[PDB]
Design a protein around this ligand. Structure first.
Ligand SMILES: [Mg+2]
Ligand SMILES: [Mg+2]
Ligand SMILES: [Zn+2]
Ligand SMILES: [Zn+2]
Lengths: 198, 190, 152, 60, 50, 129
RNA sequence: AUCGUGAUUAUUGGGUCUAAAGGGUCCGUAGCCGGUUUGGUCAGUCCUCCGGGAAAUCUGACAGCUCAACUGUUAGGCUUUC
RNA sequence: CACCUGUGGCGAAGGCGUCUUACCAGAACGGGUUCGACGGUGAGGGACGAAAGCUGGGGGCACGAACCGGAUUAGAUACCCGGGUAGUCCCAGCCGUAAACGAUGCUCGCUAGGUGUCAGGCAUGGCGCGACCGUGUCUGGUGCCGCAGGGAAGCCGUGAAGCGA
C-alpha cells in the first residue's frame, strides 16, 4: 500500500498511531488504508442492502446502496455508505467510506436514576435528525441495554454505547436515515457546551 | 505607519469601491465626496504587519498564495518567485488541494487569498481541509471563511504591486530570508 | 406595535430626554408657567397644545419637571379641568361629525367602518375610565343622546 | 451607549425688534412669535423650523 | 478545542487550529464563527480580529 | 403587546448564545429578571449583567461568557413542592446534575438544587443549561 | 373488544405555504394572555401542624405454608385533588 | 377612462387610475405636546365582502350566456365566423360564495449581510450654489439576492416557513 497524503506518510513513519492524534493533526483523512493500521480493531456491520435502480433508454440500471456502520465498541464510531454495480464492491466501498469518518464520542452516566459516572451510557440528552427521522439520546441506568431499534442497537453497539432510552419521530421506515440520524445524535453527544467546573 | 500615507494616496491604495459593506466599516475612516470610500491605511499596515508576523511563523514553501485578477496576477508571481511559495495566479482548478489523483495536488498549512470574493473556490477548499487563511479584501468584500483580513485595493495595479512588495519585505525581514527584490520587480509591466 | 384598528405599526415617538430636574438654562418659574397654563386654558386651548405652546414660545422643556405637576394635575388642583377627559371628548366629537356626514352619504361604507372603529375606541376609553372611577358607573356611552360636548 | 438622547435640540434665539431673550424649540410645530413686542421668531416647518432672527447659541 | 469567538468544541470536521498572529499563542475558530466572521479576541495578548 | 419579559430576555440570551455573541442587550429589565440573572451567574452559566437605567423599565448589558446551551421561561409557572422537582428536571433538563431550573420561592429565587437544600418549593421560573 | 404500537388525539407531545388543514377581511363580548413600580394584605401558591381519606387489592422484606403464589406482623403505596 | 403607469401608491379585505370641487377617514414622518397599561388575541355574535345570479325602475353604444344561421368534422348540441336576447352600466334592496392566494390568521421581543424603490425627516455637493435634483444616514412600507437556522424538498430567510410569548 502506497500512502498518498501527509497523514498517510505520518502514519507510515509511525508518528501517528491512533486516530485521535490524526484528528489532532487536522489534515484530511482520505486514504481508506490508514485507519485500518491506526485502528486494526475496527468492526463494521452492513445495515441494509436496499437495491436501488435507475432508468435508461433500453432496460433499467441496477445498483446496490448497502450501508455499513463502523465502530470499535469503546468510544469511536463512524458512518459510511456506498453504491456500485455489485453487492461486493458496493459493501467494500461502504467499508472504505465508513472508516474514514470515524469520530470520538465521550461517554459517561448522566441518567437521573443512574449515578455511576463511569462511562456506560450517553453523557446527557442529545438529538440526531437525518431526514425526518429523529433520535434523542436520553441517558439510561447502568446494566440495562439500549432502548432503541435493531439497527439502532447495531449502530450504538458498534459505537460502544450500552444503555440508552430514545424515541423516534417522522417516517422511521428508511434505515439509511435511521443510521445517519443515530450518527448525528452521537456527533451532538460531544458538541454540546459543558460547564468548566464539571 | 511604516510607510507614509501620502504614498498610499499616490499609489491608488486608498481608492476603494463606490459601494461598501457593513463589516468593512471598522477599516474605513472617512467617506470621500467622490463616492469611493477610503480605507484605514494605518489599519491596512497593521493588518499587513500582523499577517507578516503570522506568515513568518511558517516556511514559504508551505504557504499557499492564490490570485485571479490580471492586475493582481503579476505581483502574485513576483511574490511566488521572491518567496518560493506555490502560487495559483490565473485560472484555478477546483480540486487542487483535494483530489489527490489530480494534477496540481498540494497539502498546505496556511492559505493566502488575493481577493476573497473572486477566490471563493480556494476559500471553500481551505475551509473543507481546515487551513487558516489570511485574506486580502476590498471595500466591497466579505470575510466569510477568512481568518486574517488585509484592507487594500486589489483592483489597482500600483496598489497591488506596492502592497505585495510591503508584505514580501516585511516577511523576509521577519524570517531573515534574503530579499533582493525591489518594487519595480513587483510593479506591473506598464 | 400595530395601531388599534389598523395593523400599520409606527415609531414617530416624541423623544423626551432623561431629565430628572428643571431647566438650569432657563429663568422661568413655576408661578409663571402655571399662570400661562391657566390663561391659555381660559382662552379655550386644549391641554395637548398647552404644553406645546409652553415648550415652543416659552421654551418650557416640561411642566412636570419644573412645577412638579402635569397639565391635568394643575387643572384638577385649580378646579380648572373638564368633567370629561379630552381623549374621550375628541373621539366622541369626531364620531358625532362622522355620523352627521354619514346621514347624507349612505354609500360611504368605508367611513361607516371608520365610525365603527372610533366607536370601539370610545367604548374602550369609557371602559378604562369607569374602571378607574373617572366617570360614573351608570353613565354608559349612548351614541345618540348622552354624547354631547359637555355631558351633564 | 444604551440610553436614548434628544437629537432635536433647543436654541437661544434673540428677538430682532424688542431684543427679547426668548427661548424656542427647534422642531417647532407652531409659529413661535416673540413673547413681548412684535416679532415671529420662527415658523413651524414639518421638520426643522426656519428661524428668522439671531440664534445666540444652540442649547441641549 | 475551545474557540476564541464562541468557545464551542472542535469535535466536528472542519475545525482550524492556528497560533496567534500577534503573540503566537494558539487560537481556535469554528465554522459558524468563520462562515459568519465572528470576532475572535486572544485572551493572552488581547488581539482582536474579525 | 409585550407580555412576557422574562421569556423575552431568556429568548434573547438563547439567540445570543446561538450566534456565539459574547455580549447582548436585555429588553426591559425586571426584578425577577435580575434574580434569574444573579442565580444564573452563581451557577456560572452567565458571566456579567448590569442594569443601565434609561428613564424606562431599564435594560441590561449582559456579557455572555459562553457557558449555556438554551434557556427559556417555564410556562406555565408550575407550582412545585420539595417532593416534586425531579419530574420537571427529567422533562426540561438533559442530564442529572446538568443544568438548573430557576425557581421562585418565598425564601428567594434560586435553582432547584438550592431549593431542595432549603426544603421549600414554589413556582418554576425558567431553566438554563 | 380494549390498551400499547402511534408524538394515529400530541397539557407533556403533532401539524395547518405546496401533502387533510388559516376563517375572505375585520370589529368585537365571556374566556384567556398581559409592562416596569412604591406602598398593604396573604386567597391560589409556599413550608409546617392537626382532624380525616375503612379494610381489601399494590410494593418489599420478615414470619409461616415444602419453592411458589398465599395468610399474619411490619415499613411504604393508593385512597384525594377535604 | 388610454399612453402617462413602474419588479409605483392608497385601502381591513373586496378593491381603487380622466379632470374639478365639497365632506370624511387613516397612515407614516416631526414633536423635552396631552394620557398613564387605557393593551393582544378572541368561540359565539356583528358589519364589509370580487364576479355571477335574483327583485323593482331605468338605460342599451359596445360587448355578449341563451337562441337562430354559415362552416369545420365521421358527428360538432364546440372551438371559427355572421346576428344577437338576458346581462355588463345606473338607481333601491337580496344572496354571502371565489385559486376571496402570499394556497403563509393576528400581536410582541429576539436573530449575518449585500441589494432597488416609495413617503417623511435629516446632512452635505451641485442646482438660475433658490421652487428643485443627487449621495449618505434613522423610521415605516413596498421587491429581488442570500449565510446562519429549518424543512421531505421547491424553498423560507428582520416583510420567516428562524427562536421564544
Ligand atoms: Mg357588480
Ligand atoms: Mg387570508
Ligand atoms: Zn452509571
Ligand atoms: Zn419681539
Amino acid at each position: 500500500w502506497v500512502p498518498k497524503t501527509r497523514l498517510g506518510k505520518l502514519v507510515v513513519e509511525g508518528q501517528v498511531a491512533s486516530m485521535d492524534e490524526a484528528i489532532k493533526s487536522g489534515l484530511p483523512i482520505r486514504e481508506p488504508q490508514i485507519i485500518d493500521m491506526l485502528l486494526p480493531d475496527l468492526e463494521d456491520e452492513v445495515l441494509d442492502i436496499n437495491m436501488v435502480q435507475r432508468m435508461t433508454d433500453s432496460g433499467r440500471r441496477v445498483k446496490f446502496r448497502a450501508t455499513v456502520i463502523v465502530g470499535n465498541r469503546n468510544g469511536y464510531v463512524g458512518l459510511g455508505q456506498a453504491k456500485d454495480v455489485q453487492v461486493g464492491p458496493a459493501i467494500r466501498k461502504a467499508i472504505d467510506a465508513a472508516k474514514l469518518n470515524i469520530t470520538y464520542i465521550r461517554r459517561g452516566c448522566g441518567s437521573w436514576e443512574c449515578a455511576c459516572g463511569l462511562p456506560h451510557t450517553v453523557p446527557y440528552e442529545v438529538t440526531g435528525k437525518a431526514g425526518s427521522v429523529s433520535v434523542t439520546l436520553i441517558p439510561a441506568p447502568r446494566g440495562l441495554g439500549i432502548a432503541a431499534g435493531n439497527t439502532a442497537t447495531k449502530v450504538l453497539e458498534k459505537a460502544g454505547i450500552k444503555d440508552v432510552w430514545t424515541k423516534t419521530f417522522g417516517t422511521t421506515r428508511s434505515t439509511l436515515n435511521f443510521a445517519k440520524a443515530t450518527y448525528d445524535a452521537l456527533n451532538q453527544v460531544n458538541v454540546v457546551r459543558l460547564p468548566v467546573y464539571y | 505607519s511604516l510607510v507614509s500615507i501620502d504614498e498610499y494616496l499616490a499609489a491608488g491604495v486608498h481608492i476603494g469601491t463606490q459601494q461598501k459593506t457593513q463589516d468593512m466599516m471598522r477599516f474605513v475612516y472617512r467617506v470621500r465626496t467622490d463616492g469611493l470610500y477610503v480605507l484605514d491605511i494605518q489599519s491596512t499596515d497593521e493588518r499587513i504587519r500582523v499577517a507578516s508576523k503570522l506568515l513568518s511563523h511558517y516556511d514559504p514553501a508551505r504557504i499557499l498564495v492564490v490570485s485571479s485578477r490580471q492586475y493582481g496576477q503579476h505581483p502574485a508571481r513576483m511574490f511566488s518567485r521572491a518567496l518560493g511559495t506555490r502560487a495559483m495566479l490565473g485560472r484555478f482548478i477546483p480540486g487542487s488541494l483535494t483530489n489527490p489523483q489530480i494534477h496540481g495536488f498540494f497539502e498546505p498549512d496556511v492559505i493566502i487569498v488575493t481577493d476573497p470574493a473572486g477566490d471563493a473556490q480556494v476559500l471553500k477548499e481551505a475551509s473543507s481541509i481546515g487551513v487558516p487563511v489570511v485574506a486580502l479584501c476590498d471595500t466591497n468584500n466579505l470575510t466569510s471563511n477568512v481568518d486574517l483580513v488585509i484592507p487594500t485595493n486589489n483592483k489597482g495595479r500600483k496598489a497591488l504591486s506596492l502592497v505585495y512588495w510591503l508584505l514580501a519585505r516585511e516577511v523576509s525581514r521577519l524570517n531573515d530570508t534574503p530579499f533582493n527584490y525591489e518594487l519595480t520587480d513587483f510593479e506591473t509591466p506598464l | 406595535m400595530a395601531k388599534m384598528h389598523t395593523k400599520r405599526k409606527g415609531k414617530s415617538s416624541s423623544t423626551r430626554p432623561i431629565r430628572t430636574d428643571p431647566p438650569e438654562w432657563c429663568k422661568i418659574g413655576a408661578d409663571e408657567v402655571t399662570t400661562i397654563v391657566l390663561d391659555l386654558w381660559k382662552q379655550g386651548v386644549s391641554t395637548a397644545e398647552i404644553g406645546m405652546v409652553l415648550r415652543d414660545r416659552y421654551g418650557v422643556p416640561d411642566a412636570k419637571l419644573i412645577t412638579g405637576k402635569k397639565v391635568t394635575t394643575i387643572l384638577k388642583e385649580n378646579n380648572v379641568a373638564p368633567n370629561i377627559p379630552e381623549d374621550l371628548t375628541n373621539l366622541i366629537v369626531k364620531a358625532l361629525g362622522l355620523r352627521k356626514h354619514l346621514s347624507v352619504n349612505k354609500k360611504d361604507v368605508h367611513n361607516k367602518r371608520s365610525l365603527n372603529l372610533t366607536e370601539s375606541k370610545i367604548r374602550r376609553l369609557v371602559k378604562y375610565y369607569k374602571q378607574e372611577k373617572v366617570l360614573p358607573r351608570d353613565w354608559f356611552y349612548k351614541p345618540e343622546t348622552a354624547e354631547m360636548m359637555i355631558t351633564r | 451607549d444604551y440610553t436614548q438622547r434628544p437629537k432635536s435640540r433647543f436654541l437661544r434665539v434673540k428677538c430682532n425688534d424688542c431684543e427679547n431673550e426668548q427661548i424656542i424649540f427647534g422642531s417647532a410645530s407652531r409659529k413661535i412669535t416673540c413673547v413681548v413686542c412684535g416679532r415671529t421668531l420662527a415658523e413651524p416647518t414639518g421638520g426643522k423650523s426656519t428661524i428668522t432672527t439671531h440664534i445666540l447659541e444652540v442649547l441641549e | 478545542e475551545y474557540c476564541t469567538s464562541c468557545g464551542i468544541r472542535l469535535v466536528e470536521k472542519g475545525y482550524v487550529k492556528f497560533p496567534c498572529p500577534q503573540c503566537g499563542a494558539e487560537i481556535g475558530r469554528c465554522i459558524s464563527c468563520r462562515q459568519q466572521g465572528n470576532v475572535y479576541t486572544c485572551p493572552k495578548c488581547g488581539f482582536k480580529a474579525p | 403587546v409585550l407580555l412576557d419579559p422574562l421569556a423575552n430576555a431568556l429568548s434573547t440570551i438563547k439567540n445570543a448564545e446561538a450566534i456565539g455573541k459574547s455580549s447582548c442587550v436585555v429588553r426591559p429589565a425586571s426584578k425577577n429578571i435580575g434574580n434569574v440573572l444573579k442565580v444564573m451567574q452563581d451557577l456560572g452559566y452567565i458571566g456579567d449583567f448590569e442594569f443601565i437605567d434609561d428613564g424606562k423599565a431599564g435594560i441590561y448589558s449582559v456579557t455572555l461568557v459562553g457557558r449555556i446551551n438554551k434557556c427559556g421561561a417555564i410556562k406555565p409557572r408550575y407550582s412545585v413542592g420539595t417532593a416534586s422537582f425531579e419530574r420537571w428536571e427529567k422533562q426540561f433538563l438533559p442530564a442529572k446534575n446538568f443544568g438548573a431550573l430557576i425557581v421562585t420561592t418565598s425564601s428567594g429565587v434560586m435553582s432547584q438544587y438550592e431549593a431542595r437544600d432549603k426544603k421549600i418549593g414554589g413556582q418554576l421560573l425558567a431553566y438554563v443549561y
